[model samples]
Structures are given as C-alpha cells and as structure tokens.
Target: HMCDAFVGTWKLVSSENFDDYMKEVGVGFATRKVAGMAKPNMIISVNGDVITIKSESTFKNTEISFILGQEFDEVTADDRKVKSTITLDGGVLVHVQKWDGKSTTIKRKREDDKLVVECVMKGVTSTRVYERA
Candidate 1:
C-alpha cells in the first residue's frame, strides 16, 4: 500500500508548546487566546512550480502560496507583514520567514501519521507536532 502524506485534507489535531512559542514571539493575550483555541484546517496542493497551503479557522484564515525554492510575499490574516521562502533541507522542507526586519525559519517533516513542524526565531526554537485525524 502507498500512502501519500501530502494528499487529502488535514485538521489540527493538537499542538505541543505552540502556545508558549507564540507567547514568546510577543503575541498578546487576547490574540493568543483565540489562537490557542483555533482549530485550523489545512489543504496542500502542488501544481508545477506552485505550492499552496490554505489554513482555515473560525477566527481567521490564511493562504500561503510559494514556488519551490523561491521567495514569495505572505500576508497573514493577523496583519503581520512578512515574506517567506521555502526550500528543501535534507529530507525536510524548511521555510524562512522575514518579518519586521527579522528572520525566522520553520522546518517541516512527516513522520508516520504525524506532521512535525519546528520553528526557530532569535535563537529560540520550538517544535509543534500535529497528527492526522
């Protein structure tokens, strides 16, 4: 049997240390409250050079589009101005985000039925693991 990790729709199952990580990144209490309670649905589709990740939630919705190994403009629903670039590092896909004159990196991997995401900013790194539901 063949399983396609990138196929189908995925919903947020759970997050590990995401709240604390967002708090450390200066997210306010009110926003954090909503973010913490948000259950997002993600859909990923690849067409030639374009790759899109659509994250949908009741509080806010964001669609991130980028070409593999290329930089792109990314505007969040939360009003944070940023640009992002995604590339492959070894077996993982790494996304470098630039915002407010600062840069951060987010790495993603799929292990079994779980999606592992690691975010690094200002020398502090946090990991969030999401399982397939």
Candidate 2:
C-alpha cells in the first residue's frame, strides 16, 4: 500500500539546506548555482516488480530503475556514479547510494498529498518537499 502511494507525479514545492548538502557532496560552484535554481518534477512509477523514478528539470534530467532490495548503478545529477539500492520500511522508501568510499541516504515519505524527501550525507541533511501534481 505504501509503495502504491508513490506512484504519481510530484512537483518541487520547497527545499531546505540543499546548497549545503550539495557542497558537502562535492558539487562545483557553477553547477551548484544552476542546481539551486532548478525546479525538478519527480515522476515515480511502479509496475509489477520494478520501480522507476524520473527527475526532470532544466539543469538535468535523470531516471533510475530498479527492483526493491536489488542494487544497481546510478548517476546523480552532479554526475557522480554510484551503486544504489531501494528498500521499503514501514511507510518510507529508503534509498542508499555508495560511491568513492562514501554513502548517502535518501528517504521518501508521503504525507497527505505531498512527498517529503530527506537527503543525508556526511551529517549534512537536506529536506525537499514536493506537492502532488
């Protein structure tokens, strides 16, 4: 049921501490500037045993496809290649990415008609809220 809740389109509403998080993740200054101005639309779809997340924006568009509990290669918006895995726990979708001997975690939780995404890396956290679209 929780997985079904994620099958929809979401538009970025507000973000908090994203600049600091990108800085900690080694994003370049110019790229960070562009990223700061990006308003991404997230499209999530689930079909049978597969799930896909597509992020669309003027800065960059990236999509990831995988099955639950399976690891796959993923490239971030900042162009970092990493191994990624998604797991569901309770009502949250937890995504873990590992690269360059470091790891980051992104948690997605649905609340009412909005989706809350929390990204954490090296103790720096960013919160992004998305409204259903």
What does candidate 2 score on TM? 0.97
**For residues 1-133, what per-residue lDDT tens digits would candidate 1 score against the true structure?**
0123664567777676767767666678888889878888777777766777787889789998777788888876556678888886666878887887778787878878777778777757777666655
* Local accuracy of candidate 2 as per-residue lDDT tens digits, 1-133: 4489889899999999999999988899999999999999999998888899999999999999999999999999999999999999887999999999989999999988889999999899999999988
Best by lDDT: 2
Pairs with backbone N, CA or C atoms under 3 Å apart (clashes), candidate 1: none
- Report every candidate's CA lDDT: 0.74, 0.94
Off by over 4 Å in 1: 1-4
User: For each candidate, how many residue pairs have backbone atoms clashing (under 3 Å)?
Assistant: 0, 0
lDDT of 1 at 23: 64
